[PDB]
Amino acid sequence: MNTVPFTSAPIEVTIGIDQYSFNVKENQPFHGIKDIPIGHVHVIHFQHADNSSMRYGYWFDCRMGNFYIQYDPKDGLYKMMEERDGAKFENIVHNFKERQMMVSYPKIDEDDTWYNLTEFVQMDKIRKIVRKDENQFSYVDSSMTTVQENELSDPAHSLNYTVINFKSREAIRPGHEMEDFLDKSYYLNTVMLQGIFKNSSNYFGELQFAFLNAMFFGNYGSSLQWHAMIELICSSATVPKHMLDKLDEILYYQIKTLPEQYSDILLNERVWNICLYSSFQKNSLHNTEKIMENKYPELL
Amino acid sequence: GAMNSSNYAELFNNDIKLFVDDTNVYRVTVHKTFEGNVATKAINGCIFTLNPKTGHLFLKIIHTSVWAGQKRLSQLAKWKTAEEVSALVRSLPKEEQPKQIIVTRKAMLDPLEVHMLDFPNIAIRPTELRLPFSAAMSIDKLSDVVMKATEPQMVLFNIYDDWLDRISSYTAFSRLTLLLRALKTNEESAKMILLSDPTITIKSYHLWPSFTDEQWITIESQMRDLILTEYGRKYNV
């Protein structure tokens, strides 16, 4: 079990760790988060009490180094940093644990939610989507736009998701225009799976990352990417059976985890009704369709 | 964006454009089978592709054979139309290719858009106008060549005959849509109107009669009467 210590909490802030979150009061004696499960990526995120504008946060993997959070009063945010002096880091953490100034990552033992939300997410892939190679952790906020959003303005601060566009030459083979537009299996299986993602696990990992950035930061271009990657599968007549089964599980937990009050903005009525009721795979998402109809029947 | 009454003069400017109408591409007769079930038999169709500035009608005849052994023909027809329009643009020299193609039915947008991905600079546009191009098969010489075709075939017609010698494109198009609206609302009356006077002939190389300027006003007035009428007869007014 690992630890993210905080130098201090100078401004009042709501702190999220993965799907959990808690309130820290201005200059409350908070010194970080302990008992973080090793073996998963994690995200620690922040919404200032004053300016609820800009949710922001850091994707990291405690196996890739020792990370701490320190408020930067010039840039006005909680920054993630790496401690290279490993003895200094253990000594700091131990002092803070002895004084019990840390919140415990509060995983219930029956609970596989985070695993199920992050099953294919891998730090190495996150770092290709969020390019900041001098750090081992990745910063995301509400307002970052995606590469494809920029094509329709700061490239260094973008989310380099894989571009999916159903009305593109990549997606449509000359002479198979109707075939390829109405059945996107070529685009899924050959272009994206074989050509770009290499396997279904990398595909699913981008999809889960996009979903998580949408939910935790309300990043619009992230939600777009999640929906596009669902639609591309749902609109392919030929999908390996194992991919559809895992997709149903993946989405099931995404939908389970989504706040009930955020469904109106994070869920695209057209994509969902299409995927569940019109597409080739309308009968292949049994768990996803059941939770969707019991939790958000209004959308459908 | 979409094409409507507000931006109607854009049709007659000097950017090449084409209307594509697909309403006569897939035509059937519906009939009873011996077993008392119902069945369709396709008949020849056509794509109506029109330059509104010049009057050039690139009439692609859709021979029933294109349907053989195909499913979901109403959907195929949209794509087939798009493929034929796309082949047309590619056959024209660059300086003659349209800057815009305006589709009379929104269902043609995606099919056309996908077929024309090679032409990112050609805008594919819908319209809010209820244009009567479906009535093009009430023009006897166009229907004749469609129904006689034994294979796929492209036939070229100037839908304005020689009018542009005497009037503007804006007026030629407005006459054409009045004639076709009339033909669509009551074909018999409309045709009677156009032919009543046997002294006014249709030249061999034209689609419509050789009316003088004054005779066209009379005709145009009679078509308006017809369209008002049939509208009353329809809504009882």
Ligand SMILES: O=C(/C=N/C(=O)c1ccccc1)NO
């Ligand atoms: O020779 C001409 C007229 N050319 C046409 O009328 C025409 C008709 C349909 C398609 C292409 C050309 N210029 O005065």
